[PDB]
Specification:
The protein is α/β, with parallel strands linked by helices and 298 residues long. It has one domain (1-298): 3-Layer(aba) Sandwich (Rossmann fold). Helices cover 35% and strands 18% of the residues. It is built from ten helices and eight strands. It has helices spanning 15-20, 92-103, 119-130, 157-165, 168-176, 184-191, 202-209, 219-233, 252-258, 280-297, and strands at 23-27, 30-36, 44-48, 70-74, 112-118, 135-143, 240-247, 264-271. An eight-stranded mixed sheet has the order 1-2-4-3-5-6-7-8, with helices on both faces. Helix 9 (252-258) links the parallel strand 7 (240-247) and strand 8. Helix 3 (119-130) packs across helix 8. Substrate binds at residue 273. GO terms for molecular function: carboxy-lyase activity; Renilla-luciferin 2-monooxygenase activity. Residues 43-279 form the AB hydrolase-1 domain. Pfam families: Abhydrolase_1.
Length: 298
């Protein structure tokens, strides 16, 4: 049985409160909603959420890192309070198109630090592969580290029903993979972008449909993941931090995959999948110390 954190309401940040702290920037034919801590712009730490969530996910993690580096946190296209995709497509490369265009408008330093979760990690990994000179360090967790060989309906018409009609990922999966019980306002912040039925929920269906299954998975995504996996396995000069979820959720293949990447520090924190909601401060402190060590080592 899940229970509320009894100290959490006193520091709760509602959706409206978070969105009031964000800015909007035009990007290609749309716009991106994002948080930007602004100060210490000699460095940039870019935090990337994955399916079902938004920049809101990182709200209690980022304050720990802000004093060491500029922190930038987008809502991915079609998610959070960001604009929608010009053609209504939300595959990995659609997200990447808008993300990379946004990066060009941010006045980033030559080398950037990424923090990725879920498909947010895949975006960071793909960016790294295609910009090998622009990466200072990478932190990842519950991430798309490799293709899946070992261990249908979502891709079927029922999947459209499950998600567009029944909101499966936001209303069934999300709360099931948080160990605590979310405050009502906190869940409401995740529901808001996807409160209405139909096409507005597309990104939450398109993400799982990108799954890099060798047998049956989108061939272009399988190749993207193979490519960045090989690069990451050879990236001895690239410092990495892997945050392992305890107990996690079916997370063993993530951990063994993560261990194939050289120059990785390993830490562990409480959680299932959305560990930011169960151990944000522990995560923030680990990330802070890692970043500090990376910058001193330079």
């Amino acid at each position: 049985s899940k229970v509320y954190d009894p100290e959490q309401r006193k520091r709760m940040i509602t959706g409206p409160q978070w969105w009031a702290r964000c800015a909007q920037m035009n990007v290609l034919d749309s716009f991106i909603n994002y948080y930007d801590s602004e100060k210490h712009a000699e460095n940039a730490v870019i935090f990337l959420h994955g399916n079902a969530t938004s920049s809101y996910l990182w709200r209690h993690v980022v304050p720990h890192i802000e004093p060491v580096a500029r922190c930038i946190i987008p809502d991915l296209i079609g998610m959070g309070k960001s604009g929608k995709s010009g053609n209504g497509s939300y595959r990995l490369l659609d997200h990447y198109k808008y993300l990379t265009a946004w990066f060009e408008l941010l006045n980033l330093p030559k080398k950037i630090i990424f923090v990725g979760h879920d498909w947010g990690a895949a975006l960071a990994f793909h960016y790294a592969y295609e910009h090998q000179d622009r990466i200072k360090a990478i932190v990842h967790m519950e991430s798309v580290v490799d293709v899946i060989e070992s261990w249908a309906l979502i891709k079927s018409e029922e999947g459209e029903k499950m998600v567009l009609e029944n909101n499966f990922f936001v209303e069934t999966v999300l709360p099931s993979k948080i160990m605590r019980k979310l405050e009502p306002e906190e869940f409401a912040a995740y529901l808001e972008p996807f409160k209405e039925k139909g096409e507005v929920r597309r990104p939450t269906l398109s993400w799982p449909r990108e799954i890099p299954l060798v047998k049956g998975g989108k061939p272009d995504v399988v190749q993207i993941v193979r490519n960045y996996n090989a690069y990451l396995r050879a990236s001895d000069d690239l410092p990495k931090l892997f945050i392992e979820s305890d107990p996690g959720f079916f997370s063993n293949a993530i951990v063994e995959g993560a261990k194939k990447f050289p120059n990785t520090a390993f830490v562990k924190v409480k959680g299932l999948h959305f560990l930011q909601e169960d151990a944000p401060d522990e995560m923030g402190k680990y990330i802070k110390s890692f970043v500090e060590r990376v910058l001193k080592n330079e």
